[PDB]
Amino acid sequence: AMMAAA
Amino acid sequence: AMMAAA
Amino acid sequence: AMMAAA
Amino acid sequence: AMMAAA
Amino acid sequence: AMMAAA
Amino acid sequence: AMMAAA
Amino acid sequence: AMMAAA
Amino acid sequence: AMMAAA
Amino acid sequence: AMMAAA
Amino acid sequence: AMMAAA
Amino acid sequence: AMMAAA
Amino acid sequence: AMMAAA
Numbered sequence: 201a202m203m204a205a206a
Numbered sequence: 207a208m209m210a211a212a
Numbered sequence: 213a214m215m216a217a218a
Numbered sequence: 219a220m221m222a223a224a
Numbered sequence: 225a226m227m228a229a230a
Numbered sequence: 231a232m233m234a235a236a
Numbered sequence: 237a238m239m240a241a242a
Numbered sequence: 243a244m245m246a247a248a
Numbered sequence: 249a250m251m252a253a254a
Numbered sequence: 255a256m257m258a259a260a
Numbered sequence: 261a262m263m264a265a266a
Numbered sequence: 267a268m269m270a271a272a
Binding site for chain 10: 263266
């Protein structure tokens with residue numbers, strides 16, 4: 201699993 | 207921007 | 213599963 | 219924009 | 225399944 | 231712009 | 237799955 | 243900009 | 249920016 | 255999984 | 261900018 | 267896993 205926020 | 211993989 | 217929001 | 223795959 | 229909104 | 235492929 | 241926002 | 247691949 | 253892998 | 259923000 | 265790979 | 271911020 202992975203998540204990104206920018 | 208946000209993205210998720212699960 | 214995947215989701216994107218921008 | 220938003221997209222989902224499930 | 226998939227959905228898009230823009 | 232956005233694109234999804236699954 | 238792959239997604240892009242640009 | 244953002245991209246995800248899983 | 250923030251990202252997580254788990 | 256891979257993600258990028260730029 | 262940020263990138264993740266796992 | 268690898269991550270970079272720049």
